Amino acid sequence: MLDVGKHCAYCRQLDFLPFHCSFCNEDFCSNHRLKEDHHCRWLLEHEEV
């Protein structure tokens, strides 16, 4: 029993395949794998049009 999956940092969902973001450096369930999903700081930093 060691690191049995990472829980989303937005909805807190225990997933087996945590999506690691190479922009904000955070784990998020597949459902929130997208950037905007977890409100990626990078997306907010550059939001035009």
DSSP3 helix / strand / coil % (the chain, rounded to 5): 20, 15, 60
* Binding status of residue 40 toward Zn ion by CB under 5 A: yes
- Of 20, 27, 32, 36, which one interacts with Zn ion (CB under 5 A)? 32
Closest alpha carbon to 13 in 31, 25, 36: 31
Shortest CB 1 distance to Zn ion, Å: 22
Q: Report phi then psi at 11, rounded to 5.
A: -115, -15
Q: Which x/- pattern over 2-31 shows residues binding Zn ion (rule: CB under 5 A)?
A: ------x--x-x-------x-xx----x-x
Shortest CB 28 distance to Zn ion, Å: 6
